[PDB]
């Protein structure tokens, strides 16, 4: 829960999310762009025409919203189990050989 830490009056516009995109995302893919998304038969992504909508939208995190709209801080940890010299482990104490 981070409702009382990531909200601004009148809706918070400091946290944005991409509402429109032309293609599907691959795993662990990061993309930053502002080209106008194309939805109709009129060219977009470089020219502003018909059915060309801005690909970005704002959450508008208000100071008091429902639990489904309050800002929550999310961290995802991805673990790599590939064969390599292990560099991170638990506090499991070592023992004599």
């Amino acid at each position, epitope marked *: *829960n981070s409702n*009382n*830490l990531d909200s*601004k*009056v009148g809706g918070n516009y400091n946290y944005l999310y991409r509402l429109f995109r032309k293609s599907n995302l691959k795993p662990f893919e990061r993309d930053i762009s502002t080209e106008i998304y194309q939805a109709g038969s009129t060219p977009c992504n470089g020219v502003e025409g018909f059915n060309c909508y801005f690909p970005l939208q704002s959450y508008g995190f208000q*100071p*008091t919203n429902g639990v489904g709209y309050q800002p929550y801080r999310v961290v995802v940890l991805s673990f790599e189990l590939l064969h390599a010299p292990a560099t991170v482990c638990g506090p499991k104490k070592s023992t004599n050989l």
Partner: antibody
Amino acid sequence: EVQLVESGGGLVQPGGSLRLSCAASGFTFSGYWMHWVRQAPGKGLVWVSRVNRDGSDADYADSVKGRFTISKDNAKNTLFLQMNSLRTEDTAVYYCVREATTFGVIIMPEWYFDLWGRGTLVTVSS
Amino acid sequence: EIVMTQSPGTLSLSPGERATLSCRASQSDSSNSLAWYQQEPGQAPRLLIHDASSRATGIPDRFSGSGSGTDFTLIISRLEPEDFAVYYCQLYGSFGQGTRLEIKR
């Protein structure tokens, strides 16, 4: 003990500028989020602003939006509140108040004040 | 944005009479995030309780109030000649107008 000393303030013409400082002693100033509030003479208390532990994010009130800036250094252990283009309706005594934090795995301030400093009177008039 | 209205405006009590102060918050999404304060006319406010249920350090045991929903009420167990002050309630982003407690005569 733990006390907050207000410095600055006094007479100032409307439309001028002023700086208020809150010296902190007796507690770890870095870890506690800060608030600044005010009380008009003979009126109830009114919240003004809040500042983070690092002093980078703020939520200045609507009545003080644009003409107030808050700053929170950690090395020299004091709080700045700077005001510009003052108006006649903010003539009051300003307090700086701490915000309690659980200080656990998440700081998570509970948004409630613990100690009230000896505030300072700011008056604006021609 | 919140206007946290304290009711009623002024109560008079005999110096040994308990009472309760009822304050309604406009937006009842606080989840018992509330505080009460007692400020003498010539000095600063002090904290009385926190989280609307638990009490602070050095508080008298008489000050014990609980509330839920929009209606938040604080109850005092008894009275002493010190209640002649202003009780200010506190939601997270607002302050109450204040209630005057007077000794009856």
